[PDB]
Design a protein around this nucleic acid. Sequence first.
RNA 1: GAACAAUAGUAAGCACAAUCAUAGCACAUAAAAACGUUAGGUCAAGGUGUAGCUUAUGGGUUGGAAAGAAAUGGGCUACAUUUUCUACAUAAGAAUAUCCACCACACGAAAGUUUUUAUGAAACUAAAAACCAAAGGAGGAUUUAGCAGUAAAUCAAGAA
Lengths: 132, 132, 198, 208, 101, 99
Amino acid sequence: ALWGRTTLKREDKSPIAPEELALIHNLRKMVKNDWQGGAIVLTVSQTGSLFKPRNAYLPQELLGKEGFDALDPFIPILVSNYNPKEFESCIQYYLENNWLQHEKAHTEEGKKELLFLSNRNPGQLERLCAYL
Amino acid sequence: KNRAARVRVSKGDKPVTYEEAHAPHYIAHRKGWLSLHTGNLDGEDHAAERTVEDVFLRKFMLGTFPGCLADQLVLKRRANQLEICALVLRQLPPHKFYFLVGYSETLLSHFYKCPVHLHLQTVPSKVVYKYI
Amino acid sequence: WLIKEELEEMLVEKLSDQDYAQFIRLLERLSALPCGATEEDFVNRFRRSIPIQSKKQLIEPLQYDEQGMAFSRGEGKRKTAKAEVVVYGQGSGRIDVNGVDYLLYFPVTQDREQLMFPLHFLDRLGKHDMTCAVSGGGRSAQAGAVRLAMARALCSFVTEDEVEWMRQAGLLTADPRVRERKKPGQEGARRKFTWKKR
Amino acid sequence: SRYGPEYKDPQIDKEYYRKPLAEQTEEEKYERDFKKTQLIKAAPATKTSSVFEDPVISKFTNMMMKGGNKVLARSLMTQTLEAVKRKQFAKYHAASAEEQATIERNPYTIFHQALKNCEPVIGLVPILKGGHFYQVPVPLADRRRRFLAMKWMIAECREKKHRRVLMPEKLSQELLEAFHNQGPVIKRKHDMHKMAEANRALAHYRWW
Amino acid sequence: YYVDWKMLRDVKRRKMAYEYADERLRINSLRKNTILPKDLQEVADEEIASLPRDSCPVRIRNRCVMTSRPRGVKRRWRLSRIVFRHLADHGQLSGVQRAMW
Amino acid sequence: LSEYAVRMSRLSARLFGEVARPTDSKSMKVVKLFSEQPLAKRKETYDWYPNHNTYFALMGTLRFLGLYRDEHQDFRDEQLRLKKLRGKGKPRKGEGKRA
RNA sequence: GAACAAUAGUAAGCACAAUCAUAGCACAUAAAAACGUUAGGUCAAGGUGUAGCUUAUGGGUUGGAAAGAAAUGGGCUACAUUUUCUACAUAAGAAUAUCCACCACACGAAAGUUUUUAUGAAACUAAAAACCAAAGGAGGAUUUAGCAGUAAAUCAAGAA
Ligand SMILES: [Mg+2]
Ligand SMILES: [Mg+2]
Ligand SMILES: [Mg+2]
Ligand SMILES: [Mg+2]
Ligand SMILES: [Mg+2]
Ligand SMILES: [Mg+2]
Ligand SMILES: [Mg+2]
Ligand SMILES: [Mg+2]
Ligand SMILES: [Mg+2]
Ligand SMILES: [Mg+2]
Ligand SMILES: [Mg+2]
Ligand SMILES: [Mg+2]
Ligand SMILES: [Mg+2]
Ligand SMILES: [Mg+2]
Ligand SMILES: [Mg+2]
Ligand SMILES: [Mg+2]
């Protein structure tokens, strides 16, 4: 959201750069790594973005030329879906809170189905267990 | 009631050619096309020209061979030449038939500026498909 | 028995419905008694045999490719959508449709459930690994297409009895329902222009 | 009707096909099913082998749907079930062990029970006699009654909410109020029942 | 004889419009251009509005060629809808047929 | 956008023979006007009609030379003959109104 | 002018039916649908009978054809929350006729006013902006359509 394109407009209807914004201009200085004693942990996003396609999760696509070039050497940590153990643990956590109220959700069947429909993606699994 | 190009049922005595006994919805199903030329195909040109030419040929032939025309004309167009093919009643002496063949072919050749062939098929009486 | 048409062809004569009926009833009376040899031969001119009745499918021969074992193919068609699905028996559960994950390509729950139907039906839900090519139609039509194709591909891996089960669940039949043509003088292929009485 | 009358409806149930060996008449029956060389309609997109799908929830989903939006109506249903769920989880933790034994947290059972309570017993049909239209008490088929319930629910939680208020909110409210029999829907059911008693004499005009 | 006086009018129109096409084009070049000064363009304006009124193409009508009908024409055969049907239904239009689907 | 890109583009146009110097949207029409065949010049336009004079004249003459036979014109004739006989004809020019 | 356990009916023909089309079946749809009925519609598609005009009821040129007291048909867009805006495919952020003291203000502008643009010899024609934001808060008697890939909603292309 720092180096991207901005939706907000002047009364001229003319769009404004993210540079033009005081909050962004200053929040840019905080990421430049000029200083000592600190650590900047960042997250590149889709869900809230602007002008980015829905299927783009990759850092250089979301950040663009400006973003990735002005972002310097950084550590690219990848966040993936639940593995079998993570998944089974989350399901068990829901059962412990008795948040799965469907009679057949206590079977192995129910687990195979939730695993398939959610592709054991955490947000998707939460959505599927919310109305269940 | 659709009336187009139909020969209505009479008291049951009416002689009817194979052509006349088939209503327009049978074209390309049972009876075929009285003309053939490239013009109506997808990517092709000068349909209009060939249509007018056609109309004039039917009229012309009908007037040049009075009373002896059996069925409607057949017009085949191939690589710049038109072969007209006709069903003719035997009325005239072959003198008059050859006179008119030559006269026509030359006349139309000079009119439409392309080689014109004329093919006469001779018939005792109107071929009868139905009733009668 | 012969049809009336056949009998009518065998006597070189027109017949009536009650005629045909009479005759057939008589042959019935005949066959219901002790059958002589010349009698059996007699009534058997009036026999025809109805051709093969079996609806059993034609199993795709399973296929072994480039040191890889056990992959089968199937092709679904639904409503302007075509789908070609290749399934590997040797893999874990995942599905790649047009080179991407099936959770990405089919955002809607309903379509993922459609893709799930045949596997969940055969309890193969963890055991197979599939690649797909689907074109045309909308999202739901594509889900339907892949559904059918997947179903048809999984028939190589399963027992002949479960094939009959999938058919009886309506998994193996193409869905004939397709968009009707709009008709001139109407609005919607059924919907009519508003009709004013007076 | 792109299917000839020859085509039978499919049976989606997995349990039916998995455990055949204990039933004679049914073995004979589905033997006659497939062996009849019987054609089968292709299983519809809505219906699944899913262990999670309630045909009543799906019907309701459909009756809620405007235009062609399943996505939107399935959204609103999903959200409503989640909302009833969380409303009851709220009512559970602010309660005491007795009421923690009493209160129902399964949104499905709540949906069902709330519909069973809201379905009318008896009904009214207009009958013309001597140039007058009398309203007459008529016994109703099961399907007609379930329909009347669902339709009344949706009609109310479409119509009577304040425009600021979202659908899954109002619907979860009315589901829970009809669970306990105090909902306006139930008042409608009673208006019918009372109109049916007021006219009970006219029950003679019914010829069927 | 053209089938109708109107058709005659139209023939004339197409002739004139063919004749002055070059003048009209050359002038409307000037007229449609931002690069030249307005003073040239006003003179050029009177220039093209000087030209005979029946030389301008918008005054042309595509008419049925046999029957002279002013509308209900199909451009490809230059034929009235009625005459078109009359030819096609006797099957004198090659490759044309009723449509079932 | 750069100066490099613009120099490149100018070179591309000059090479392929498209418009060199920058023009308005409104002026490009001029190029269009000379790129095309002006509407009144297309054979679909000035040649639209068959010449009806040539068809009518030629087939009339060929009727009088007794080659072509026109039943329509014959019908018209015989009707007209029978009409002048019955006494209703076409008035010689100038005669009808005042007389 | 039939009775099938048959009592006076045979009948060719045309319709129906069958086939053909919608690229495999099937189903559906399309197409087809006689004889007649309504002196139904059209002399202005063209052609024509009868009767009419002929220095005109014919042929040309130039310019005009307005308009809304009122009534009404069919559509379009709406009246919003299953909504409106922006991003974007379907997990987002915001707006939300009411807040409150005070404006301001939700949904609805397809209408008008100004400025542009396209086409054209000619702009009155169509389109895009900016301003403007009205009636409309789901409609009386009475009414139309639809049996499934239909109704409903959404998108696109073509003919001239
Ligand atoms: Mg519709
Ligand atoms: Mg005329
Ligand atoms: Mg025009
Ligand atoms: Mg007969
Ligand atoms: Mg067929
Ligand atoms: Mg059929
Ligand atoms: Mg029809
Ligand atoms: Mg038929
Ligand atoms: Mg009349
Ligand atoms: Mg009239
Ligand atoms: Mg006339
Ligand atoms: Mg009006
Ligand atoms: Mg209309
Ligand atoms: Mg507004
Ligand atoms: Mg809007
Ligand atoms: Mg202009």
